[PDB]
Structure 1
Amino acid sequence: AGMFRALFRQAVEDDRYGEFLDVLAEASAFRPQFASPEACSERLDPVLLAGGPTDRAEGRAVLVGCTGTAANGGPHEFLRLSTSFQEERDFLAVPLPGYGGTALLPADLDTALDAQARAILRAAGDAPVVLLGHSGGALLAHELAFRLERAHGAPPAGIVLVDPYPPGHQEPIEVWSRQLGEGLFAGELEPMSDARLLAMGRYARFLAGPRPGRSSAPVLLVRASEPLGDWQEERGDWRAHWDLPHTVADVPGDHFTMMRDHAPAVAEAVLSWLDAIE
């Protein structure tokens, strides 16, 4: 119903997705923000979408889902996936500050990361943590991992990057900008208000900036095996990418479906990798 949503839907139809994201990023600068993690206007209390075994709880790594940037998204993007972890691993999902307008936006990415970090650290206690993220959420998972390591002196035991397209390897995202945009108008996990579209724009901007910090935690790179649209392989690889991953796993489905009807395949790869890492 909001004007930003109408403008955006029109932009996607006109193949100007990227161009409009810049507008959202520019517009978000006028939204009230929180400059310190304490000022965050929301309880980032991680939701335990899945509970692990009751017998062995000492030392086993817990999974923490890092909510992505989708304006129509939320922590439940991990619901389907978490199913496979019931009785296997504790699966927590942490909201992304500034979403679900009365929610203050983070002044910068680091502030949002510290807010999540504190919520995660208290929720995990002394159990090893393995961050997991999808698409934009994958980039955030890594950024958060490095933040925990460098700024909080608490590095996660590992990072699960599901279909990440980091700076320098985003030609596919550009070529498939339309299907990605249309993906934001399919359904919604939370009402996709103009406020949320602004949050997404701000985070898209944050994630485009230079972030030299590289986490020392091992990485499991999970990749979709079905292309989202036509690609012409002469351009190079359309698949997700990450430097020096510890393990790589190709799964059924495309960028979206890999986390839906094919989520069990992702969970399987993650469960095998966790056993290998521990």
Structure 2
Amino acid sequence: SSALRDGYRQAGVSGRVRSYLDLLAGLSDFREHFDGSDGFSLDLVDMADGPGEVTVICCAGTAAISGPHEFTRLAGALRGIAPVRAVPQPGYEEGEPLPSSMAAVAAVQADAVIRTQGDKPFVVAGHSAGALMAYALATELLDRGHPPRGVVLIDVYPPQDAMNAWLEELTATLFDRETVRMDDTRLTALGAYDRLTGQWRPRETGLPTLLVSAGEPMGPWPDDSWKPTWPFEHDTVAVPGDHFTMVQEHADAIARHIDAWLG
């Protein structure tokens, strides 16, 4: 383990997760950054192949355990349904700098999408804060003449009461599902991205948008205001599972909705 990892777990246990996230963001300021115009680049990951003209491009999340591996199950379920690729969030792996802004990361991701796709159409997808990253990327691509055919936002909470109320539960569950180790590179990246997405605001694009919502909350709620939402026009479906299990244990349900929506 590490001091940062142990501290993060303790922040969950003691109900001080927001404080710990702000500390990680502060620490991240002392790492190397890229601004989008300094030559940094990255590649997409090929996850699966499938028929049709539209590739499903999945953006990695911003959790300390996030990465292209987050979409292995969804990709598995989409094999032979549609091509699938994954976009990394730079800075969660050794030797990668952190973006200095949402614009910087969106620019280098859009470079890689355009490089890889050419004029082959695609949709962009993401989960949780990864959905915000997906939408920022979609916006950048639209602003560059390469609009996606649409955006799939899986359990997005835009700038969040339920997420705030569940921060401790979220943190404990991340450790239960730590299939990729939360090293200090990952924890400081979590800080940086958490601050970037928290300060960012989505712009209206007119893009077809599919909100994929968890079927149930991670804790009791008095009304239905625990659900993911999105401020711009979008279609909505619900799948079995909670914030976490929806896109892993129940990724097949998400695959079927994506299949229908692409139809």
TM over 0.5: yes
Identify the residue that residue 225 of structure 1 maps to in structure 2. 215
- Quick check: 2:136–2:202 contact (8 Å CA) kept in 1? no
Per-residue CA shift, 1:18-56, capped at 9, x if unaligned?
Answer: 11111111111111111235533xx63211211013xx5
Whole-Å separation in 1 of the counterparts to 2:36 and 2:43: 17
Per-residue CA shift, 1:140-184, capped at 9, x if unaligned?
Answer: 11111111112x2321110000000001xx000011111111122
Q: Which amino acid aligns with 1:89?
A: A
Q: Secondary structure at the match of 2:238?
A: strand
Identify the residue that residue 272 of structure 1 maps to in structure 2. 260
- Quick check: 1:175–1:231 contact (8 Å CA) kept in 2? no
Per-residue CA shift, 1:203-232, capped at 9, x if unaligned?
Answer: 110111142522221101100011111222
Whole-Å separation in 2 of the counterparts to 1:215 and 1:183: 34
Identify the residue that residue 28 of structure 2 maps to in structure 1. 28
**Deviation of 1:267 (Å):** 0.7
Q: Secondary structure at the match of 1:214?
A: coil
Q: For structure 2, which runs of at least 5 residues remain unmatched after alignment?
A: none
Q: How does 1:239-278 map to 2 (within 5 A)?
A: 239-275=227-263
- Quick check: 1:34–1:105 contact (8 Å CA) kept in 2? yes
Q: For structure 1, which runs of at least 5 residues remain unmatched after alignment?
A: none
Whole-Å separation in 2 of the counterparts to 1:132 and 1:163: 11
- Quick check: 1:70–1:200 contact (8 Å CA) kept in 2? yes
Q: Which amino acid aligns with 1:130?
A: V
Bigger mean CA offset, 238-247 vs 221-230: 238-247
Q: Which amino acid aligns with 1:126?
A: D
Q: Secondary structure at the match of 1:52?
A: coil
Identify the residue that residue 161 of structure 1 maps to in structure 2. 153
**The one of 198, 208, 232 aligned to 2:198:** 208
Bigger mean CA offset, 136-145 vs 236-245: 236-245
**The one of 23, 30, 50 aligned to 2:48:** 50
Identify the residue that residue 11 of structure 2 maps to in structure 1. 11
Q: Secondary structure at the match of 1:221?
A: strand
- Quick check: 1:77–1:189 contact (8 Å CA) kept in 2? no
**Deviation of 1:188 (Å):** 2.9
CA 1:124–1:38 in 2, change beyond 3 Å: closer, same or farther? Answer: farther
Bigger mean CA offset, 218-227 vs 92-101: 92-101
**Deviation of 1:139 (Å):** 1.1
Per-residue CA shift, 1:103-135, capped at 9, x if unaligned?
Answer: 211111211111111111111121112000001
Whole-Å separation in 1 of the counterparts to 2:38 and 2:55: 25
**Deviation of 1:189 (Å):** 4.0
Supply the RMSD in Å over aligned alpha carbons.
1.5
**The one of 110, 115, 118 aligned to 2:108:** 115
**Deviation of 1:101 (Å):** 4.7
- Using structure 2 for the length normalisation, give the TM-score: 0.95
- Alignment identity in percent? 41
- Quick check: 1:142–1:215 contact (8 Å CA) kept in 2? no
- Quick check: 1:73–1:189 contact (8 Å CA) kept in 2? no
Whole-Å separation in 2 of the counterparts to 1:247 and 1:237: 18
Q: How does 1:52-91 map to 2 (within 5 A)?
A: 52-53=50-51, 56=52, 60-91=53-84
